[PDB]
Amino acid sequence: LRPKLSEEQQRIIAILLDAHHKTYDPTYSDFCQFRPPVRVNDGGGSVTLELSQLSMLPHLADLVSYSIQKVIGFAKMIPGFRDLTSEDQIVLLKSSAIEVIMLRSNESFTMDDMSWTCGNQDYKYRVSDVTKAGHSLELIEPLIKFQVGLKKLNLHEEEHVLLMAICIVSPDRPGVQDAALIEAIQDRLSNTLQTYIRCRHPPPGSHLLYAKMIQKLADLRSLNEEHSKQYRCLSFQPECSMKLTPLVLEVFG
Numbered sequence: 663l664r665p666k667l668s669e670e671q672q673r674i675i676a677i678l679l680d681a682h683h684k685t686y687d688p689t690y691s692d693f694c695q696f697r698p699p700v701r702v703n704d705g706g707g708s709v710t711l712e713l714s715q716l717s718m719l720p721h722l723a724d725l726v727s728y729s730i731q732k733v734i735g736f737a738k739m740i741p742g743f744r745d746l747t748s749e750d751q752i753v754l755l756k757s758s759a760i761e762v763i764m765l766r767s768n769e770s771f772t773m774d775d776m777s778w779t780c781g782n783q784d785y786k787y788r789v790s791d792v793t794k795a796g797h798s799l800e801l802i803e804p805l806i807k808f809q810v811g812l813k814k815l816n817l818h819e820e821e822h823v824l825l826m827a828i829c830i831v832s833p834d835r836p837g838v839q840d841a842a843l844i845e846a847i848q849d850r851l852s853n854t855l856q857t858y859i860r861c862r863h864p865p866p867g868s869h870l871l872y873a874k875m876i877q878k879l880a881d882l883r884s885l886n887e888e889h890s891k892q893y894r895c896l897s898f899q900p901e902c903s904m905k906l907t908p909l910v911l912e913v914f915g
């Protein structure tokens with residue numbers, strides 16, 4: 663059966679697409695406002711050198727901080743999100759932050775050279791740039807694999823924004839109070855996504871796509887955990903706080 667999208671589901675998709683268009687700048691025009699990227703010589707991927715310099719951290723931290731602000735903006739536009747208490751809203755935002763950033767960054771990710779390309783050489787981010795910010799291959803390699811896998815799903819923008827919404831409105835996040843309400847909102851979103859795939863996504867992929875998308879959400883949980891561990895290590899580096907931002911410190915601290 664291929665039921666048609668209800669008027670409510672059509673509205674949801676329209677709202678989410680609009681929300682994304684208002685919070686994701688495909689030209690990355692604000693990136694020049696961040697502290698400048700600095701790339702020190704580290705062909706050997708020396709952890710000691712990377713930690714002593716953290717050359718790319720100010721720039722990446724500003725980019726992630728900027729991204730978190732956009733995600734907060736996007737989340738506020740998710741139908742039903744504002745029906746949640748402020749406490750639950752913040753809990754969901756802090757816990758899904760890095761995951762949603764990983765998902766949204768897929769738009770700049772390119773398989774041409776496996777990088778996040780946001781402009782000229784200066785704003786092209788490779789595995790080496792992320793290691794220069796203090797992260798290790800234990801996170802980066804799996805992240806790249808995740809980006810490629812997501813790219814290969816060839817998601818429609820409608821599916822992309824629904825996936826980000828579903829990621830944010832997860833009832834299984836530690837600290838949530840009204841799990842039932844959150845689950846109701848997520849179910850409304852998941853049903854919209856399943857209905858959309860069944861009647862708008864052409865084969866080969868009309869089906870099976872939903873399961874693959876849900877598996878990406880599970881993958882994100884593992885990446886989230888690894889990122890938290892790496893952030894912990896990074897925070898132990900003296901003077902690291904100045905290289906971050908108040909928003910980043912609160913969300914991951």
Ligand SMILES: CC/C(=C\C=C\C(O)(C(F)(F)F)C(F)(F)F)c1cccc(CCc2ccc(CO)c(CO)c2)c1
Nearest residue numbers: 722723726729763764766767769770778787795893910
């Ligand atoms: C390895 C994971 C990570 C960031 C980690 C950052 C921090 O741990 C620290 F400290 F290092 F700064 C933080 F800030 F969290 F604390 C990361 C995840 C996904 C991508 C990228 C690459 C860059 C890119 C990001 C976001 C968007 C859009 O938001 C776009 C443009 O699409 C490009 C990096």
